[model samples]
Target: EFTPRPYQVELLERAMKKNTIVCLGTGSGKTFIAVMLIKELAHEIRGPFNEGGKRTFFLVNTVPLVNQQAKVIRKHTSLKVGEYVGDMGVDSWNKEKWNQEFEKHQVLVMTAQIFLDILNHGFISLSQVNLLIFDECHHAVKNHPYRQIMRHYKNLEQNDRPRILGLTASVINSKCKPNQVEKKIKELEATLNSRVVTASDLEEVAVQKYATKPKEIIVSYNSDRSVEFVSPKVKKLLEILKQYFSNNNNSSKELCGIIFVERRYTAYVLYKLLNELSAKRDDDFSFIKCDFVVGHNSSPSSKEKSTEMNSKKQKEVLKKFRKGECNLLVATSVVEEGIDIPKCNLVVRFDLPKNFRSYVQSKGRARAKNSKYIIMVEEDEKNKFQEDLNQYQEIEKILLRLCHNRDAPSEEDFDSFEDELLPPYMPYGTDGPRVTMSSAISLLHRYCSKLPSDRFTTLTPKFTYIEQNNEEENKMFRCTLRLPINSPLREPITGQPMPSKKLAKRSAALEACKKLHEMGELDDHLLPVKISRKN
Candidate 1:
C-alpha cells in the first residue's frame, strides 16, 4: 500500500472522514495524497481493488494527467486504471460501461472533458462506486458539466456512489481574503455533500513531526536593457539570480530549472533567448546549457500541423531536461495545471500570474527537499497591471508558512525584463492578417503538413482576408469553410493508405496555399489590403 508522511497520513485520515474540497495550492504533492487514498480504497485494500472484486474510479482534467495518474496507481495496486474513454479499450469506460467493469477492475481514470461529453449519457450510474476522487476538483462550478458531476454524486445513494475525497493544497487565490477560491470550494463540497477540512486540521494531531520546507525563492524581475540600468529594483533582482546560479555553478554542474512566461509568444522568445544565453554561459559554466520543450498550445507546429502531434516528444524533452540533456527550460503557461514537468532546483516567473493560488502552485513544482528557490520577475514601474499583480505577492507568506520557512526575496532578488517582451515576428510580406475564424482554423488544419515554424517563402500574400463592414462582422466567423484544392499535392497513388499523417499534412499546406490564391475576398491581384492593429 502507498504510504504518506506521518503528517500527510494524518491529513489523509482527516480528509477521508469528511467530504472534502481541495484548494491544492501549487506544487504540494496533491497527487501523492490522492494516490494514497486511491491505493487504500482500490489498491492493496480488502474491498473493490481485490482481484475479481468491485472496481472504483474517478476523473482527471486532461489526457496527459489521466495517463500519469493511472501510472502512479498501477505501480502499487491490484486495481490500476484500465481505460480512459470510449467503448473499444480493454475496459469499455463510458458511464454505461463503468458498472459492468466495476467488479472486474479496481480503478478507472478518464479526462473530465470526456466526462462532460457523456454526463447526460453516462452508462455507469456510479451507484456502486466505493469512492470518488476528483483530482483538480476545484473546477466544478454551477451549470458546468464538471460541476454537475459532483451534484450528481451528492444526490446518489450513500451506499451507491463511492465516498467522496477531495484533495488539494490550500490556495490563496487573491491578494484579498475569501475570493472565488472560498466560494468555489463551498459549492464543490455541496455538490458532493461532503464536509470540508485542510492539512492544518491534521497538523493539530501533534507528534515529533516537523513540516518539510518546499524550497522557495521569490525574486522579482528587472530589465537588463535600460541605459544606466534605470530599474534599480530589477538590477538587484538580477544580482540575486546571478548569485544563485553563480553559487550553484561553483558547487556543481547540474542546475535544472523552469522559467514561466506569460504567453505562448513570450515562451517562444524566452526559449530562444535562454538557449542563446545558456550557450554563452557554457564557456565557463558546464551545467548552464538549456533545452526547451514546446507545448501544443504554444507551438506553431501543434497549430500548423505536423505528421503527428508528438505530445510524447514534449514528454521526452521534459524528461531529458530533468536528467540533464540541458540545464534549464523557458516554459509557457502550459506548466500550470496538467503537464508533468519534472522538479528542478529553481523556478522563475518571467510573468506573474493573476492570482496567488497559481503563484503558490507554480512555485510548488520545484518543491525539492533540498534548498529550492522560486524567482519572480517583476517590473519596477507602477502600471495598472503591475498594481493588480502586486496582490499575488501575498502568496509568499502562505507558501513560506506551508514550506516551514520564513522565505522572502532580498532587495536583489527580482529582475525586470520588459525590453524582452516583443511582438511575434512572422516572415516578410506575410500581410498583417485580421483573419476569419475559418481562415485561422483552416490555416492550422492546412499547414499541419510541414514542421511548424519551418520557413516557407510565400510572396505578397497567401490567404485572402475578407474585410467585414460593421453590420456584417457578427456573421463573418465561419464563412470560409471551403476545402483548398489538392493541386498542391503531387500525383497521388490510388491504392495507398492516403500518405499517412506526413502526406496529409503536406497536402494540407498545399491546400492552404491554393486557398490563398483562390480566397473569396480578392477582386484581383492589384487589390490594396487593409492592415489593422488587430493583426
Candidate 2:
C-alpha cells in the first residue's frame, strides 16, 4: 500500500498486468511486490480458490523466511496464509494443520524442499496453483523440486496453467559465472514462462531491524584451492580445523564446529579428524551431539555412499547447541546451497568446499549480528580458494549496490566497504535512449572522455562499425565520443577488503557489456550498455 522504491514501482506496473520475475536486494521489498501481485489477483477474482479455481503457492529456501513471509503477507493482505512444509518445530508436524489450511487459504507458504518432497510423494498436485511465488527463485536448480514444480506448472498450460512470480536477493551464482547461469535461467524461465528481472527493476524502502551481509567478501586463496582432485595431505590440514573447533570455548557451546569439504572421502577424513580431536578433548563430545548432513544423507547415490541422518533432528540439535546445547554440524557441498544453520556460531571449512560461493554460504551460517568467528582451514600458502571467492565480489556489489542504504541492521562492516564489497552499480533508468552502429565513432570518443583512462571504454571506436541513438545523432549537443575496445585492457577493478562504506568502489560495470564489446557490431544490441550524461 505504501509507495515503493522506483524499481519496485516498475515491477508493480510490469507484473500487475500479469506474472513477473523480481530480482531484488535481500531485504528489498520483493515480498511487498508479491503482496501487490496477490492483492491485485485477489481483487480481480475476489473469493476463494475458484470453487473450481486454482490455489496460490509460495515457496522459499528456509522455514524462517517462509514463516516470516507468510506472516507479513497475511498481515498486509486478506489472503489466509497456510503452510505445507514438514515441521522442524518439534513434535510431529500437524498433518491436519496443512490439510485444513491448504483447503481454506488463498496463499500458502512452504519451503521449496517441502513442495519438492510433496510432489515426489504425490502428496499434492499442480492443479491448485492460480499463482506460484518463489521467494528465492535463484535457487531453481535442475532436479530440485522447485525446478520440477515450475516445469509441471508451465507444462500444465496444455491442461491447467498457473501464473508465477519469482523473487530473490542476488541473481545467485549457479555454481557457474552469472552469465553462464543464464542457460539454467532459461530452463526455469521456460517453466515460469517469464523473463527474470532484478533489484534495479523494483522499488525498495529501508527498514532498520535487519542485518546486512554486506557484499564485500575478501578471499585470500591458499594453495589448497584446487578442485580437480583433493590430495591425501588435505587430512593434516583438516587437523587444524579439528583443533580449532575442539577448544572449550566452541565445544562448550550448544552449536559447535562444521567443516565443509568438497569431496566425500575428503569430507570423511575431515570428519574423522574432528571426531578424533573431540575424543582427545572430551570423548563424550560425540555423545554431546554432533553429526554430518551430506547429499548422501538421503540414500545410496552409488554403492559407495549409503547412509541416512536426520537433518531436521540435527538442525534441532543445532538450535539447542546455539542455545548452548549441541556440539558441531559438518557436511560437504550440500551445506553450501540453502540449508539454514543459525545455531552454529562456529564455521570451519576443513577444506575450501570447492570454491568461494560455498565458502560464503558457510560463513553465512553464523549470525553476524552475534559476530561469530569463522575459521577457514587451508592446505596451502597459495589459498587459491580465496581467489575463487573473489569472483563474486563484483556482481555481489552490483546486486547489493542499489539495495544499500535501503534496509539493514547496522552500518556495514568496514571490511565490507572495500570497493568489491559494495553492490555493483545498476543504472537507475532503463527506458533511456540506447545505442547503435552508425554512431560508433562519436560514441566511443564520448564514452572515452568520461573514463579514468577508458575504465568505461566503449567498443564502437575500436571497430569501424557504428550505431547511434536519436539523442546522440547531433551531438553538437554532447561533449565527446571516441572509445577503444581491444588495445588497453585496464587494471582489473578491485573492491574493498572488509564491510565499511568509506573506500567503496563498485560502480556501473563493464562485465555485462564485455561480451557485447567483443562481438562488436553483433554484440552491441545483445546486451546494451547504459550511458548517462549530467546536465
Candidate 3:
C-alpha cells in the first residue's frame, strides 16, 4: 500500500471539494496529490456504464513530462493510461480513430497542444472530460496552448465544465515584479476557475521535511581577456569543477549534477570541453563522465543540422544521466521542470535563470540530501546576482501570502500601489542625432559634397571590406570607411566584424559620422543644417 504525506492528504482534501491549484515546493508530492484525486474521482470518470464514461486528461507542457507523468499514473492506478505527444501523429487522426482511443483509455496524458487540437477538431469535447489536470500550470498565460484550451472550456455551460486541477511550484514568471505577484496569481486562478491552495501552518512543516533546501553557493571569477578564443563563462565553469573535485578529496565520481545554460551551443561547447578535460589525466576531472541534452526543436536559421540533438538522442543522454553512467549533464532550460532526477546532488546555473519560475524549477533539481545549488557569475556581476536572488525571495513571499489568503486586496489598497513610469523620450540631445546606418551614409555624403570639386574626385563615401574569423560565425566582414583626401577626417575608420558585408559597411559609416559630428564637421542633426548661399 502507498502512503500519502500529511500535507499531501491536506491538499487532496481541498482539491476534492473544489477546483484547486496545488502550490507545493518541488519534491513535495504535488503530483501525488493529483494522483490521489484521480483515484478518488474514478467513478465520475469511468461512469456507471463504462461505455459512456467521461475521460480524464492530464495535460503537460513538454514531451518528456508526457511520458514521465503517464508512467506515474499507470504505476499507481489500475485504469488504462494513454500517452500522446506531437510525434504520435494524432493530428492527422480522424473522428473514428479518436473515438477508439477514447474508449480504450480511461486517462489520457498528453502535451497541451494535441489536446487543444483534438478539442478544436470536434474529435473530443470538454463535456466528455470529468477531470483536467495541468502540470506546471503557471504557463497558462497569454496565447499559450494551455490558455487556449481553457478558452474552449469557458464557452461551455457551467454544469458541463470539467473539474480543474493545476499543479505548480511557482505561480509567477521570472519577469514578474514583487508588487505584481498577487495580481499574477489571481490571473492564474481566474484562468483555471480554481483557487490557489497550499499546505499551511503545521502541514507546511511536514511538507518541508520532504523538500530539499540545498545549500546555496556563489562562485565568482574575474573574466580574463587573455583567453580571447574561449568564452569567459566556459573558463569559469572549468575552474568551478576543478575546485569542486579538489575540495571533495577527488571522491566526486558519484557527483551527479546538471549545468543549466541559456542556449544549445553553450551546452554543446561545455559537454565537449568537459570530456576533453576528463581525458587529460593531468586534471582532477579524469573520473568525470559528461553529456549534453537540448530540446528537440531546432532553430529555423540553423542550416547545419548536426548541431541539434533529436528526441532519440535527448532520451539516450537523459537515460545515461539517470542510470549514473553519465554523472554530469550540460543542458538547456529543457530540464528545468518535472524531469525526475532523484540522485542529482548539484546544480550549476552557468547562465542565471530569467524569471521566478525558472529560478524555482532549476533550484528544485538539486533533490538529494545535503545537495548544493551553485551560481557562477563574473566578479563585477556578483551584486546583480545577489539582487536577483533578493527579488525572487520577495516574489515568493508575496505569492505564498496570496495563496493562503483568498481575499483580493481592497480597492483603496490597490490604488495605493503605483506603477513605475518610463523615462521621457527626447528627439535630439547629447546622445547625438540618433542616426542610423543609412542616414549616416547620407550625412557623410552631404558633408563631403560641400567641399570644392578640386579637393575630391567623388562625394560618395567609399567602403572597403576585409574578411576575418569571428566567434559568432565561420567568417565575418570588417569594413573601413574612406573619405576623399580633402575630407575633415585624416584616417579611415574601421568597424567591428559583422555577419554581412553590407552591415559592416553601414557600421563603419556610422562610426565615421559620429567622429565627424564630434569634430564640428557635421551639425547636431549629424549633417550640415544650413547650405551657404554662395554654393
Candidate 4:
C-alpha cells in the first residue's frame, strides 16, 4: 500500500468526503495524493481490470502532464493505463477501436480538450466514468474545456454523477480580493459539485532540512538614463557578478544558472549578449557559454534566428548545461513548472510573474546548494512585486478559509467583506469575454471621452503659438498648436521627446486617471466602470 505524506493526509480527509477541489503549494505532493487516491479507488471501484467496471478519467491541460502523471501512477500500481493525446491519432480511429481501448484500460489519461472532442463526437460518455481527475484545476474557468466538461456533468442525472477530484498549486490569481476570492471558490464548488480542501503554505520547515531552500531576492530594475536600452544594464550586472563569483570561487558546473525571461525574443537577446560579453573577457571568463530553450510549438525569434534554438537543440543544450559544457541557460517560462533541472543553483527572473502561482513555481526550481532566486522587475512595478510577495505569504490563510467553508458564502459574507471584493472581477461568477489590446484601447477611449476629468476644468485645448528650432533646415520655425494647461504631448515612462504638432489628448486623459489613483479619488459605489489590465 502507498502511504501519504503527513501534510497530504489532512488534505485527503476532505477530498474523501465529497467531490473536492485541492489547493496545495507547489511541490507539496499533489500528484502523490492524487495517485494514492486513484490506487485506493482503483482497488475498491476499478480493481486492476477494465471488465464492466467503472472507469477513471485523468484529464490534464497539456500532453506532457498527461504522460508524466501516467508514468508516476504506473510505477505505484499494476493497473492497465492507456493514454490518448493529439499525437496518438484518436480522431482518425474508428469508434470501435476507441471503445475497445477505453474498455481495455482501467485508467485512461488524456488532454481535457481531447476528451471533450471525443465527448462531442458521441464516442465517450461522462456517465460511464466513476471518477474524474482534473489536474491544474485553476483552468476550470469560463470558456475552458474543463468548464464545458463540468457543464456536461451538471446536465447528467444526479445518480449518474461521477466523483470529481480537482488539483491546483495556486487558486488565488493576481489582485484577488477577500470576498472575490470566496466567490471564486464558491463558483468552483458549484461547477464540480465539490467543496474546497487545502493545507498550509510551503514553508522552509515543510521540506526536509537537508533540502536546499534558495535565498530569494526581488530585484527592481532602475536603469541609467544614458543607456539606450536595458541591454547595457543587464550586461553590466552580469559583469559585476562574474568577478564576485570568481573571487568567491562559486563551485558551479559550466552552466549553473538559468535566466527565466517572459518572451522568446528576450531569450535570443540574452543568449547573444552573454556570448558577446564573454568574448571581450580573459580565459577566466570563458565559461560564459549560454543557450536558450523554448516550447516546441513557439516560433523561434526571427530577429536572432541564428541564436534561437529549436526544441531538439534545447534538449541538447540542457545536456550540455548538466555535463559542464555550458555556463548559462536562457529560457522562457517553458521550464518553469514541469521540467526538472536539479543543477540550477542560480535563477534570474527577467520578468515578474503575472500571478502568485507562477511566482511559487518559478522559485521552486532553484534546488542546488546555496541556490539563489532573483526576480527582476521594472522600476514602476516594484510595489506590485511587493504586493504579490505579501499575497504569497497568505496562501495558507486564503486556501484554508475557502476550503473549510462548508456553506456557500452568503451574499452578506461577500457584501460585508472588503468593499473592493464586492461586485467582483467578473459579474455573475464569470470573466467576461476577452479583447485584443487595440480593441481595449478603443473601448477605453470611448468611455474616458464621455467621463470628463474634473482636475482639468478646461477640457478644451487652447491654441498656442510656439517657435521651434528645425535642425534639418537650420532655421527657427513658428507653428500654432492647440495645447491644454500643463497639457504637454508626451509619453511618460519613455525617454523620447515630444512631437512638433499637438498629439491626441489621451495623454492628458491618462494623466488624469493616474492623478485620481494617486490621490485615491474613486467613489467605490458610484464608480461607473472599473478598468483593469492583465499585465
Candidate 5:
C-alpha cells in the first residue's frame, strides 16, 4: 500500500467527511489523494454482491488524462477500472453498450463530455454513482462541461446526489487582484458545490517538500530588429537556443525538454527551424531531436489545407517523446496538464503564458531535479512581465489563505446570487400599419366589386416594373388601379425601389392602398367590412 504525504493526509481527512476540492500544486500527488478516497469507498462503488453496482466516475477534460489517470487509479486500487474518451468511439455507443460497460467496471475514467451525454440521454441517472471526482476542476466555472455536469447534479434530490471530489493545481485567475480573489473562489465553490480544502502553515511546508518548484530564469531580447526570414523575435529565439546547445554540447546527460508557444504555426515553424539547423551542424546540436504537437482543431488560417493533427498522430508524437526518441518538443498548451513526462528538465516559454493557470501548469512541466523554467520576453515587455508575475504570485497567496480560513458558502448564498438578466426583445420594423400586398390588392378588388360594373375593366390590380437605362438599379414598380376615368384617385402609384420584383410589387400595392385611403375611397381598416355576409 502506498502511503499518503502529510498534506495529502490532511486534505483526505476533510474530503472523506464532506464534498471537497483539493487545490494542490501540480506534480504533488493530487491523483494519489483521489485514489485514497476511492479505496475507502470501494465497497459502496462495487456494491454488496459485486454485480452491476453503484460506480465512481472520474471525469477529466482531455483524452490524454482519461488514459493517464485510468492507469494511475488501476495501479493504486483493486477496483475494476474502465477508460472512455471520444477518440475511442464511445460517443457512438448505444445504451446497451454503455450498460454493459457500467455493469463490468466499478470505476470508469472518462472525458466529462461523454458522462454529460450519458446523463442527458437517460441511460444513467445521477444516483447510480457513489462518487464523482473532477480532475482539473477549476474549469468548473462558466459553461464548461464540468459546470454543465454540476447543473444536472444540482437538480437531483439531496440524498440521491453523488458526493463530489475536485482536484486542481490552481483556481485563481492572473487578472484577479488581491481583493477579487475571494469572489472568484466563492464562485468556484458555488459552481462545484464543494468546499476548497488545502494544507496551510506547517502542513503546507510539508507539501512543499514533495512539490517540484523549478528555478525561474528570464531571457530578454531586442524585438525591434528586422529580419528577412520569419520575424526579428524568432531570429533572436534561434540565436538563444543555438547558444544554449553550443554550451552544453559535451554534456553526458540526456536532455529532454518542452518549448511552449502560443500558436500552432509558431510551434510548427520552430520545429522545422530547429531540425534544419541541427542538420546543418550535427556536431554541436545533434542531440536536439525535436517534434511539434498541437490540438486537433484546425487553425483559422488553415481552413483550405489539412494542417491539424488527428488523435492518432498526436498519440504517436507523444509516444516518441515518452520513449526518448525525441529529446525536445516544440508544443502548444496541449502539454501543460496531465500528460506524463517525468524526466522533463527544461521548460521554455517561447510565448508568455496567458493567465495564472497557464503559468503554473506550464512551469509545473519541469519535474526533474535542478530543472529550469525559462521565459523569453521582448525587451519592451520585460517590465510588463514582472508586473504580471507579481500579480499572479499575490493572487495565489490570497487563494491559499481563503481556502484555509473561509467557511463553505451555504446553499442560500447560491440561491441569493443574482443571475444576469436577458436583454429585452425588440421588433424589427417601424410602428406602421400592418398591411400586406395581398390585403391591399384584395381590398381594392372588393372596392371595385361594390362599384358600378362599367367603372373598371377586370377588377385586378396590374403591376409593371419601372425601366431605366440601368436595369439593375431600377427595381421600382408601379401599380395601375383601373378605376373610372373621372374618379378622384390617381391612375397609378409608383413605389420606391426594392431588391426583388416580388418585394417591389408589394411596395407598390402598399403605396396604392395608402393613396386610396387618403382619397377617402377605402376604409381606415383597409378591408371590405361593409359588403360582408347575410346576403
Candidate 6:
C-alpha cells in the first residue's frame, strides 16, 4: 500500500467536503486519492428508506481503465469489489448480472457507458450511490456519458445527490482566447456541478518520485513549424533519434519509450522506418526494434480496419510493451488516454496540439526518473513555436487560476472571471447548459451499441449473385452482389476489404442484397439479372 501524500490528503479533505474535481498531472496519484476515498465511502453508508451503507461507483472511461483501477483497489484493500463492462454476459446474465454484482460489491469499477446504460434502464439510481468518481473527468463536457450521467444526478434533488469526484490531467486549451477558456471552464462546472481544484501548487507536498520534473526537448527544423506533413528532414531527425536509443540502451535494464504521432499514418510510417533501420549493420542501431499499435478505425494494417486494434489485442500489445518485449512503440491518440506505462521514460511528440488533454497525458508517460519529453518541432518557425508555447502556457495559466481561486464559484464569479480575464466573445462553442435529450440518447447509443467482442466481431455479409453461361463467347457472366449496410464496401461488388468467411446461406444473402439495391442505397450496376423482392 502506498502512503498518501500531503497533496492527496488535502484533496481528500476537499473531496470529502464537496463533490470536487481534482486536476493534477497524469501519474500524480489521482487514482491513489480515489482508492483512499473508495475505502471511506465503503466504510460509511447512508441512503433513502432503510439502507445499510453507501456504495462507491468508481466509473472509468475504458475497459482497460476499469481493469487497471480495479487491480489497484483489489491490491490494497479486501473490499468486495465487482467488475462489469460488456464482458459479463455469460449464462445469459448480462444486465441482470450487473445489477446483482452492483449490490454485492461494495466497490464497483465500470466503464462509463455501461454504468450509464444501466442507469438509463433504472438498474440503479443516484440515491444508492454514496460517491461517484469519474476518471478522466475532463470528458464531462458536452454530451459525453460523464456529462449525461451528471445531468441525471443533477436532475435529482440537490440533497439527494451523491458526492461526485471528478479527476483529470488538464482543463485548458492552448489556442483558447480568454472568453473561450472561461466558457469551457463554465461548461465543465455546469456539467459536473463541481469546481476545479488544481494540484500544481501543492507539488511541494507531493511524492518526490511522482513529482520529478521531466526534461523537455523540442525538435525544430523550420520557421513555419507546423507539422502538417512529415517532411524528409523530419525523417532525418528521427534517424538521429535512432542513434540516441541505441547509445542509451542499458543492458541491465529494459529501455522503453512511447512515440506519439498526430495521425495513424504517421505512426505507421514511423514504426516501419524504425524497424527497417533496426536491420542496419551499425552496432549502435540494434536496439531500434519498433512496433506500432493504432486505433480500430485507424486500421493501418489493411484497407479493412481492425478494431482500432480491438480491445483484446490492444490490451495484449500494451502488456507486452510494458513487459519490455519491445522497447519502442508508436501510436496516435490511443496512448493519450489513461494507459499507464510507468516504465516508459522517453516520450516523443511528433504531432501538434495532441489537444490539451493528450498533451498532458503524453507528458505523464515520461514518469521515470531522469525521463525526457521530446517534441519534434519545425525549425525557424518562430510564429508557430510561440503559438505552441503560448498554448501550453495558457494551460499553466488556467491551472494557476484554479489553484488560487475559490473551491466553488457562484454564477457571478463565473461571469466575472470572463470580464477580469477572458474576452467578451470567444472561439469555443456556445453550447448552453440544458440541452435536449435526443443528442444525449444518440451519444449513449453510439457508445453502448457494441457488445464485448463487437469491435472484432466479423459479421457475415449477405450477398447476391447473377449467373450467365455464354458458350459462344469464352466468358461466363456472373456477379456477387454485396450490400452497403452489411459490408464495408461500395454498392457494386468490390468485395470486403479484410479476411472473413462468406455467408452460410447464399439465398438469404441474395435477398438482403436485393432489398438494399431496391432501397437505392446500393448504386446501379450492369447486372445480368436484376430482380427485387423482400420478405
lDDT of 6 by residue, 1-535 (tens): 3887775787788778877887676555667787788777655643322354467777776666777777888989877677777676532334456556555666667677666555543444556567777766666543466655654543445555677777777674334554466667766676566677776455543554455656676666543432226566665566657656565655436677777776667667777666766676765555567766776435545676534576677778878887778877777667667666747567766666545555666676666656778776666565777686777767667656746665555555423322111111111212212222223223222322331225532433334544434455443334354333433344644322212222212222333333433445332221112233331
Better of 3 and 4 by TM-score: 3
User: Each prediction's Cα lDDT score?
Assistant: 0.48, 0.47, 0.67, 0.58, 0.65, 0.57
Q: Which candidate wins on TM-score?
A: 5
> Which ranges of candidate 4 are over 4 A from the true structure?
1-3, 44-51, 200-213, 219-222, 226-230, 243-255, 279-284, 299-325, 377-535
- What TM-score, computed on C-alpha atoms, does each candidate reach? 0.58, 0.47, 0.69, 0.66, 0.70, 0.68
Candidate 3 per-residue lDDT over residues 82-164, each given as its tens digit: 87777767654555666777767777787776765455334444566787877777776665677656654533455575777
- What is the C-alpha lDDT profile of model 4 across 246-278, one tens digit per residue? 744655334377777777666777677667767
Ranked by lDDT from best down, the candidates are 3, 5, 4, 6, 1, 2
Task: Sum up the clashes in candidate 6.
Answer: 21
Candidate number with the higher TM-score (2 or 6): 6
Native-referenced Cα lDDT, model 4:
0.58
Model 1, 12-76: lDDT tens digits are 77666655555433444577877677666544334542232445557776666766777777876
Q: Candidate 1: where are CA atoms >4 Å away? A: 1-18, 22-54, 85-104, 116-119, 154-161, 170-185, 200-241, 274-286, 297-309, 337-342, 368-379, 382-535
For model 3, what is the error of residue 439's alpha carbon versus the real structure, in angstroms, after optimal superposition? Answer: 41
Q: Which portions of model 3 miss their true places by more than 4 Å?
A: 48-52, 201-212, 224-236, 250-253, 300-302, 407-535
Instruction: Between candidates 2 and 4, name the one with more favorable lDDT.
Output: 4
Location of the lowest summed lDDT over 10 successive residues in candidate 3: 417-426
**In model 5, which range of ten residues has the least summed lDDT?**
423-432
Candidate 2 lDDT, 126-245, residue by residue in tens: 555577776656565544556545434422344555666767544544466644544554445554456555544321233321342323322233554231355544544444444544
Q: 57-143, model 5: which lDDT tens digit per residue?
A: 777776667667777777767767777767657654555676666666666777776765565435555666777777777665555
The TM-score between candidate 3 and the true structure equals 0.69
Error of 3 at 432 (Å): 61
210, model 4: CA deviation in Å? 11
